[PDB]
Amino acid sequence: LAFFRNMYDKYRDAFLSHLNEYSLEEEIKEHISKYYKLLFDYNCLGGKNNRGILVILIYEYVKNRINSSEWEKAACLAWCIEILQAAFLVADDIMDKGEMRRNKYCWYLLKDVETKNAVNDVLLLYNSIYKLIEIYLRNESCYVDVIATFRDATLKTIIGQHLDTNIFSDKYSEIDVNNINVPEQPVIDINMINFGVYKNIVIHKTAYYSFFLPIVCGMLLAGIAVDNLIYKKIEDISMLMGEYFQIHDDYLDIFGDSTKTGKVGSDIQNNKLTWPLIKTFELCSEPDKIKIVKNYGKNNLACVKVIDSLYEQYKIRKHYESYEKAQKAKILSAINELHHEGIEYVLKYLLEILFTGV
Amino acid sequence: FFRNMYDKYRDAFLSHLNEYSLEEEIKEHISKYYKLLFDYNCLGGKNNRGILVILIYEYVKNSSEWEKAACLAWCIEILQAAFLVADDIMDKGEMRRNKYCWYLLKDVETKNAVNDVLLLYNSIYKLIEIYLRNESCYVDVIATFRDATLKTIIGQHLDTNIFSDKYSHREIDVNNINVPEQPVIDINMINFGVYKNIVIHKTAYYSFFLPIVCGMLLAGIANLIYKKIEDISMLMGEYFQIHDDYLDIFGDSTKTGKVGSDIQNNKLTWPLIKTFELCSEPDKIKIVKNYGKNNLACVKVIDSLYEQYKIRKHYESYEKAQKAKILSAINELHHEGIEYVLKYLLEILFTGV
Numbered sequence: 259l260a261f262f263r264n265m266y267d268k269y270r271d272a273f274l275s276h277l278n279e280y281s282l283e284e285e286i287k288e289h290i291s292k293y294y295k296l297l298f299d300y301n302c303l304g305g306k307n308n309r310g311i312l313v314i315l316i317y318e319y320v321k322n323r324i325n326s327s328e329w330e331k332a333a334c335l336a337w338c339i340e341i342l343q344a345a346f347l348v349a350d351d352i353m354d355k356g357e358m359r360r361n362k363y364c365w366y367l368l369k370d371v372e373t374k375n376a377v378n379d380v381l382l383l384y385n386s387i388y389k390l391i392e393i394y395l396r397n398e399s400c401y402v403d404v405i406a407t408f409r410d411a412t413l414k415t416i417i418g419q420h421l422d423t424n425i426f427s428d429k430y431s432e433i434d435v436n437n438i439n440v441p442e443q444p445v446i447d448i449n450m451i452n453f454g455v456y457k458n459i460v461i462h463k464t465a466y467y468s469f470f471l472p473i474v475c476g477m478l479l480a481g482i483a484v485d486n487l488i489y490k491k492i493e494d495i496s497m498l499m500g501e502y503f504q505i506h507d508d509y510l511d512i513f514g515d516s517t518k519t520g521k522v523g524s525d526i527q528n529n530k531l532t533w534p535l536i537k538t539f540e541l542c543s544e545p546d547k548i549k550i551v552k553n554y555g556k557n558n559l560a561c562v563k564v565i566d567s568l569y570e571q572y573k574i575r576k577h578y579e580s581y582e583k584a585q586k587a588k589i590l591s592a593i594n595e596l597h598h599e600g601i602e603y604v605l606k607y608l609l610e611i612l613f614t615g616v
Numbered sequence: 617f618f619r620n621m622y623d624k625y626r627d628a629f630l631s632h633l634n635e636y637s638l639e640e641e642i643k644e645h646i647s648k649y650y651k652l653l654f655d656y657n658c659l660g661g662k663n664n665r666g667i668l669v670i671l672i673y674e675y676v677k678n679s680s681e682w683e684k685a686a687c688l689a690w691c692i693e694i695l696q697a698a699f700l701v702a703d704d705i706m707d708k709g710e711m712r713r714n715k716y717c718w719y720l721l722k723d724v725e726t727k728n729a730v731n732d733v734l735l736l737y738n739s740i741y742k743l744i745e746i747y748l749r750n751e752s753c754y755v756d757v758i759a760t761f762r763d764a765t766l767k768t769i770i771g772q773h774l775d776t777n778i779f780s781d782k783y784s785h786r787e788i789d790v791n792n793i794n795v796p797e798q799p800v801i802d803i804n805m806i807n808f809g810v811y812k813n814i815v816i817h818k819t820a821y822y823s824f825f826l827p828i829v830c831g832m833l834l835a836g837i838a839n840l841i842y843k844k845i846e847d848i849s850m851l852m853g854e855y856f857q858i859h860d861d862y863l864d865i866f867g868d869s870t871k872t873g874k875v876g877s878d879i880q881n882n883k884l885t886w887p888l889i890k891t892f893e894l895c896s897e898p899d900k901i902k903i904v905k906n907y908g909k910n911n912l913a914c915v916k917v918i919d920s921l922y923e924q925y926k927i928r929k930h931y932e933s934y935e936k937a938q939k940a941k942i943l944s945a946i947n948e949l950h951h952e953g954i955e956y957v958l959k960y961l962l963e964i965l966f967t968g969v
């Protein structure tokens with residue numbers, strides 16, 4: 259764990275090093291190294307580090323101890339999930355018109371960067387992962403399985419980000435290849451406001467890259483055979499934990515303190531299908547439905563305020579806290595079926611520090 | 617038969633998505649969206665890169681072997697697609713292959729397009745796994761796509777930032793979200809050394825080195841010929857990009873499929889550098905004053921300078937001398953089969969087929 263924290267530089271600088279081998283003029287090489295050193299630092303640091311720490315812990319509690327060449331490979335994988343997070347979050351804030359990420363301006367918003375650099379930079383962060391895994395793990399037998407898990411995790415996430423972004427779109431509620439002029443007015447689709455659709459999305463956008471991937475990396479490296487039925491159990495727990503983590507997130511979009519969360523709430527105005535939106539539709543009077551249809555998805559104070567107060571009226575904070583309690587018990591029940599005492603402690607521990615880090 | 621086989625790889629990938637734990641109506645929605653993403657962006661081009669895989673493979677060496685080569689061939693066409701979607705966002709593109717750029721469609725927008733670039737990119741590796749996973753060259757193939765992709769990313773970064781304030785002692789300003797940069801050229805960067813740097817990275821690696829290498833690995837070449845091919849590919853990428861820069865100024869968008877944008881986007885182009893080489897100090901001053909401005913009278917001045925200094929002429933002469941340098945490099949390959957394909961690629965490069 260202190261190996262992880264202290265070895266950020268190592269992996270950052272191993273990748274910067276690879277590009278310094280490019281056939282470029284020395285001045286150009288210097289400019290690239292400055293730009294890219296910032297892109298990693300700005301975008302990979304400042305968070306809780308829960309995914310990376312998970313890789314480290316799973317790895318340790320699966321093995322009976324671990325040399326520093328072994329740690330160097332696990333912390334590699336751990337940082338690569340933290341680079342994956344970076345890439346995803348850079349793109350998310352473009353998609354969601356983010357203002358603040360980890361208490362600092364979103365990367366795409368910087369005048370030195372903009373959306374043109376940010377898009378190129380997502381691709382860079384994402385490909386650095388695979389270069390770093392080649393550097394530290396090409397000779398391991400889990401090597402192909404590790405790179406497969408990253409790419410399949412990433413594909414699931416890309417699908418869920420697509421659904422998060424289009425579930426209410428006109429495309430769905432034939433795509434028009436002739437319209438570049440007539441913008442679509444954000445409206446909610448009431449046929450999509452149920453927990454079934456919500457789960458399809460949050461499992462895909464959150465659960466795979468955030469829980470499944472880092473646990474599987476820890477296990478693949480520690481050497482659990484890919485045909486072991488523990489991986490399926492692990493997948494089922496990841497889905498429970500993923501939906502749990504994402505609901506807490508949706509909850510913070512309205513109830514959090516932007517100085518503590520490090521980001522600014524935007525789901526109402528960005529027309530998202532969130533747990534609060536679904537719970538309220540489940541509970542609210544028929545005229546309040548007409549009221550959510552009218553006011554949701556509008557970057558307008560009085561419109562957002564209507565929604566906030568319907569969430570105040572329908573006691574969404576209380577319904578959340580009773581979801582947290584019921585879902586946590588559900589996760590713990592599944593963890594207790596794992597028949598691996600090492601992984602169980604880790605996942606119990608994770609579940610405690612999930613919202614805070616540590 | 618290259619193009620016959622397109623649906624096979626697209627639908628193989630769409631089948632992969634269809635296995636996701638998603639409600640049936642949602643799977644239907646995603647099949648429609650993604651089929652269009654692939655059809656819209658993979659189809660319509662010269663397919664030079666895919667064809668080059670196929671041909672290199674044939675000339676280094678049954679229908680199951682062709683299933684693997686066409687797979688790689690279509691994966692480079694998918695990478696072309698990913699890079700172009702991203703490039704048209706970055707370059708404020710208007711048309712690509714005589715249709716509106718994907719990012720502009722009201723049903724897509726930049727928010728979708730950014731995600732879709734990653735979808736396209738990642739689709740490649742799933743396809744190579746489906747078709748080549750038990751090939752001994754599997755890991756070498758995925759490493760080649762990956763490294764050529766890193767190279768292209770760096771090159772696109774340089775193309776997009778070479779004249780920028782951050783490069784012109786001081787740091788990226790992490791507190792500036794409000795004061796937009798006023799684009800201006802950096803005269804210190806207007807040289808062919810810097811231009812070859814950008815151009816081998818953003819074009820030559822994925823456009824030449826990658827398709828040729830794909831066919832050579834699969835045909836089973838383990839070998840100092842790889843460095844000779846690298847060197848030719850760089851020669852070819854430069855030649856090809858200089859042609860592209862040429863078309864940006866002198867082309868017809870109904871024939872190029874795309875609307876020229878380099879002057880207003882502040883690109884370090886071959887016509888820029890060739891003009892800077894040959895012009896007077898007061899035209900240098902005109903260039904500084906007018907380049908990188910999305911303004912008619914400004915692009916007009918630059919365009920007028922390109923007429924005045926006979927850039928069309930200088931390009932025709934460049935094309936002649938550089939084709940000759942590529943053929944001289946090709947003749948040093950001492951591989952009859954690869955040599956034939958490259959000579960022929962060189963003949964069809966600007967037109968296709």
Ligand SMILES: O=P(O)(O)C(O)(Cn1ccnc1)P(=O)(O)O
Pocket residue numbers: 346350354422463464507521
């Ligand atoms: O709410 P999102 O899904 O946009 C978010 O959680 C990011 N994200 C992206 C994928 N999964 C989660 P963030 O609120 O941090 O902006």
Ligand SMILES: O=P(O)(O)C(O)(Cn1ccnc1)P(=O)(O)O
Pocket residue numbers: 699703707775818819860861864874
């Ligand atoms: O001039 P570009 O680099 O933008 C281009 O050639 C595309 N491209 C992208 C990378 N290398 C070349 P296009 O003129 O097609 O928009």
Ligand SMILES: C=C(C)CCOP(=O)(O)OP(=O)(O)O
Pocket residue numbers: 304305306307308343360464468503504507
């Ligand atoms: C994936 C979700 C739900 C939000 C971002 O995740 P984290 O809260 O784990 O982000 P950092 O700790 O990395 O800032």
Ligand SMILES: C=C(C)CCOP(=O)(O)OP(=O)(O)O
Pocket residue numbers: 660661662663664696713819823856857860
């Ligand atoms: C790498 C360059 C110069 C961009 C255009 O590529 P092509 O001219 O190969 O484009 P398509 O045939 O794929 O349309």
Ligand SMILES: [Mg+2]
Pocket residue numbers: 350351354
């Ligand atoms: Mg977001």
Ligand SMILES: [Mg+2]
Pocket residue numbers: 350353354422
């Ligand atoms: Mg989002």
Ligand SMILES: [Mg+2]
Pocket residue numbers: 507508511
């Ligand atoms: Mg959120």
Ligand SMILES: [Mg+2]
Pocket residue numbers: 703706707775
């Ligand atoms: Mg470009």
Ligand SMILES: [Mg+2]
Pocket residue numbers: 703704707709
């Ligand atoms: Mg372009």
Ligand SMILES: [Mg+2]
Pocket residue numbers: 860861864
């Ligand atoms: Mg061009």
